[PDB]
Design an enzyme around this catalytic site. Structure first.
Site: not given
Ligand code: ZN
Ligand code: ZN
Lengths: 656, 656
Positions: A303, A308, A310, A389
């Site tokens: 990720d 990023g 940011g 997520y």
């Molecule tokens: Zn997980």
């Protein structure tokens, strides 16, 4: 030329970004180029330190850029000296692929929706061609696919279905995986399973109030409020990006990739301003899934390096993510066209109560003699979303001098379709009918550039051990003797170590050129980290190769400028073959890391075995690690904090 | 006969205590006896459950007592049936010694101060005979001394010096250790070291404001206040000792030994009231020091069994230990004379904000689609003092259904004297001139009597493992496959297990008679505990023998009434030889623990290597473990909680 920032470590201002992009556009006059990354190129460690404490020259403001050129493979990167508005360094990397920006991603969904082959698959899966507007997908890096290497910039689309736009699509994944060419904006292939699974005919597993009212009976009544007010202000003081709180002073930076970057950290020990860390941040991460079935090996996103922290950061205002008297910081990046973009309230800063700092009472007068001091903590945080997520990152500073990283994982589980008579097997969990949540790990790489009480540091592993002498011997008569075995790393190879429950291992980052006048030990900050899972993916695997840093809980290499990203500078589609990143820094493992400028990379995280409780929306799961001062101070550093209650023995007596 | 309590699990009221002691005094008419312990004898598990859910008979209120008789060795224990005011069970244990009450201890200091031999030692150590009022000592169990066994009730006094009554004596320990006869109130022996060390001539290491003002320059200015108000009340509801909060319902009990005892815990799953735990508490602990030198082997106090977390508990009011709208509970014990004693505000109950419970935003409309729900936690706590140390215990209940135990260790390090030219060696740390803080561990035994979704439970260890298939095989082509290996304990011996960092071990307590309708797995509560240090003391050592439960992170034995205390019912001076406590419950290790009524004892804690930062007053050190529901619910149990912010996709669109 743009105005200089207040501090050499400040992120590029929007004016500096425009200046940088104009400069690059000029340098490549008459070429159709697009901007992928325009961010601050931080001053060399030496330059910064000399400037900061030796009256050294101001380091030049430099901007690092990454661009694409229509028709040219790979990318081009370089540096722009903002003061003179000119490109001072540049090179082409034709066999690499860059981080995927929101623009690169926010468009894949429409291309699959309009692709004839994708449509045919949707129809075969039970979704009529005229309902494609109900088909959705989360655009992912292809991660790595041996069928294309970096020869083409690719994305893989995890397809989902929504019966209604307000649904949470994750209860309804489709069985195929289209592969999209990012530059061409078109589908070039579709992975189709041997065993087909048509869309779930079940209701979506939703979580908004209206859904819950329909699901369970009604919502619970709003609970009595818990208000937190700071009537007289806050104790911390922000000067630009510089923070000052409870003797801590540090620079709060931020970039498209790592998100928050804490620099030039020091502690004011009663007038003696002592350095602790030069830089600290999350340098990379990887979430390797554990289902061996094709094409799930392609699920091991990094990720930070591929999207990023940011770029994906959430504007913190609205959500009521930061409670109390908050101080916000905005973030500035560049879009494909070279124009500055701003994400507001990217970082929030606040302080909050944290229970007791310390207490002690004398039983002699029934605890009338007593002193109690409450603790307060400084929190610097952000929340970013990686499609399904959400990662909540909290950098915590405490009044005993400890620094802690708290992460709360929330959001939605990655899901793949499950047949009516299919077992989630050993690789996943059936968290809802026809839904399979695959096993996976969440691993992070903490990057620490120390300066413990000054320059020249070392690192070591500390293990609790019983005396080697046996029970009944003169040396250990009753067999209760035990001590701490300190193994200080002399060579890079020595540092490649993992957490060990058997010895309650912890790591020390110390300054071997000094000694604590009481204990005789060097001043240090001890890493106390316990959520250190071993990398489950096999040695030599896709995951192990693209994330060489994850194989050990700790990696210590010599410091070099620009040694930030453990999986290389351009992560997407890298096969993991080659000497770059951490694999390059480790080298043959023989360079000295004892009493020099070193870089300490810590791997921590969790092994996630999904369960129904995590669906359809997951309750926050905690992850934490901390760095405590040990032999750094000569005594509890918080004793000069006004106790919240204090009664002396003599006071208790006279009090009647 | 005293009035019955509101609930069968309520602690004995002061009236019940008086009734019990009057009854015993009568039964032993014409005997000089004294009361050591008078506490509730909880109803048999079966009786309680039948009463609670099968219209069964009310269990009789019983009181357990322990007494001493002048001239008789050991103790006498028995039961008093309060309804009929009569002793229904009684026996004499002449070869055992009981828990040390505050009265038993608060008097040792004066006896050593007036002992000729002790005085001579003080004089030799540099303290003139006319300054004995400046000599202090912390009265400890002798722990265990092979020179006396249980033949005499003994205490050992750790001697200290105070230049001024308001000083913190710990910077000035003396080198000898008097041994006092508790019943005779006299010194019977003094352990004198071969190498003598006279009192430190340094200033005391103090921590009150006036001391700090003199030490550093001045105190820091009072920081702007952080006020926490609950204007509309609290969400929890207390009915006697019964708590109801966020669907959790449980009974808050308390006794002289374990301190807080949470019973009959259940969760209201939308009308289906489901049992989780029948009883949970700290059943014992041990703090083994690691210096092999005599007489330091005698430093391995079992605070719970030898002093009592109840007896040592702090009245929580004043200290500002509990912030916000608090609900308090008082504690009632008996004194030596059989009169009830009350310690006010022994337990405090409050709820507080706990950050985010969960969140998720859709990147598609730039996170305009988003739902955020804040978390609130229920805290039930107490703080007790074991002479030098303070243990802060927090039982935490959370809105996702998890239960957590948080402990904060604070107070003062145990210290022994150090010669000017003496090294704290490998066994301790010189935290101040002439002060040696010995290495040691803090170990606790969590006792769980489960009833996961009902009766008939089992336990298992879960270990993360890579697929046994190699990289490149059809079964694990890219070598990323991994799963959870569940080893369910069939026999007691199978459960004797330790935490394993190598597999990220966790333990399941489940109900094998049920299955989650989605995952197919049994409902369970998973123990996620990582601060599980191995017992450093050698096998067969004093420490290992008196604390058989500490050798493993987990011990699972069949349930039996009155199986509470792992180190036996009468801990002081027990040699550790014999079949009692956990050693008795384990037996030959062959009894079945699969799908029956079981008892799960977990060992957790820390290995404490002192450092100057911990002195003269130690900053709170954290310890935590939690039990999470996994496959217990069919989905996130907190979704019906009003979000603090929520915007649907359709809402975001229409919002402009
Ligand atoms: Zn997980
Ligand atoms: Zn300790």
């Amino acid at each position: 030329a743009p105005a200089r920032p207040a501090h050499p470590l400040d992120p590029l201002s929007t004016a500096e970004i425009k200046a940088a992009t104009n400069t690059v556009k000029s340098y490549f006059a008459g070429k159709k180029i697009s901007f992928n990354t325009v961010t601050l190129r931080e001053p060399a460690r030496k330059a910064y330190i000399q400037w900061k404490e030796q009256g050294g020259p101001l380091p030049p403001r430099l901007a690092y850029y990454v661009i694409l050129e229509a028709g040219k493979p790979g990318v081009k990167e370089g540096l722009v000296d903002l003061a003179s508005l000119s490109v001072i360094e540049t090179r082409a990397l034709e066999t690499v692929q860059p981080i995927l920006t929101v623009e690169d991603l926010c468009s894949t969904e429409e291309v699959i929706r309009n692709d004839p082959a994708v449509i045919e698959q949707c129809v075969l899966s039970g979704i009529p061609a005229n309902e494609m507007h109900k088909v959705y997908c989360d655009p992912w890096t292809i991660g790595y696919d041996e069928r294309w290497g970096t020869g083409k910039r690719l994305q893989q689309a995890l397809v989902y279905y929504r019966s209604d736009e307000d649904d949470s699509q994750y209860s309804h994944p489709l069985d195929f995986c289209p592969i999209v060419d990012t530059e061409e904006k078109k589908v070039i292939f579709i992975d189709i399973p041997n065993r087909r699974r048509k869309v779930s005919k079940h209701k979506h597993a939703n979580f908004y109030p209206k859904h819950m009212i329909e699901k369970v009976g009604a919502m619970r009544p709003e609970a009595p409020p818990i208000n937190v007010t700071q009537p007289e202000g806050v104790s911390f003081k922000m000067t630009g990006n510089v923070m000052e709180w409870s003797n801590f002073k540090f620079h709060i930076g931020f970039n498209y990739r790592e998100g928050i970057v804490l620099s030039d950290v020091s502690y004011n020990d009663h007038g003696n301003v002592r350095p602790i860390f030069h830089r600290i941040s999350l340098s990379e991460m990887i979430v390797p899934y554990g289902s061996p079935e094709f094409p799930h090996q392609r699920k091991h996103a990094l990720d930070i390096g591929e999207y990023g922290a940011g770029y994906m950061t959430n504007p913190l205002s609205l959500g009521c993510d930061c409670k109390g008297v908050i101080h916000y910081l905005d973030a500035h990046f560049s879009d494909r066209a070279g124009d500055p973009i701003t994400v507001k309230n990217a970082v929030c800063i606040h302080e909050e109560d944290d229970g007791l700092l310390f207490k002690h009472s004398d039983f002699r007068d029934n605890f009338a003699t007593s002193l109690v001091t409450r603790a307060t903590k400084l929190v610097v945080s952000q929340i970013f979303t990686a499609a399904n997520y959400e990662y909540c990152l909290y950098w915590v500073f405490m009044q005993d001098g400890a620094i802690r990283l708290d992460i709360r994982l929330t959001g939605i589980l990655n899901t793949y379709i499950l047949g009516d008579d299919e077992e989630a097997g050993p690789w996943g969990t059936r968290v809802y009918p026809n839904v399979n949540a695959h096993n996976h790990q969440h691993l992070f790489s903490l990057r620490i550039d120390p300066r413990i009480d000054g320059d020249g540091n070392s690192a070591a592993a500390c293990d609790a051990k019983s005396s080697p002498y046996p029970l009944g011997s003169p040396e250990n008569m009753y067999g209760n003797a035990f001590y701490s075995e300190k193994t200080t790393f002399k060579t890079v190879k020595d540092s490649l170590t993992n957490y060990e429950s058997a010895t309650g291992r912890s790591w020390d980052i110390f300054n071997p050129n000094k000694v604590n006048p009481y204990s005789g030990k060097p001043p240090s900050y001890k890493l106390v980290s316990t959520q250190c899972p071993p990398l489950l993916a096999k040695e030599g695997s896709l995951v192990a190769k693209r994330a060489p840093w994850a194989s050990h809980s700790v990696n210590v290499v010599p410091y070099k400028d620009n040694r930030l990203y453990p999986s290389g500078d351009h992560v997407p589609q890298w096969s993991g073959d080659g000497v770059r990143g951490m694999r390059e820094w480790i080298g043959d493992g023989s360079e000295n890391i004892d009493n020099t400028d070193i870089l300490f990379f810590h791997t921590f995280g969790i092994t996630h075995f999904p369960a129904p409780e995590d669906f359809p929306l997951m309750p926050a799961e905690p992850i934490t690690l901390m760095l405590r001062p040990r032999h750094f101070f000569t005594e509890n550093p918080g004793l000069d904090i006004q106790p919240s209650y204090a009664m002396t023995t003599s006071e208790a007596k006279r009090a009647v």
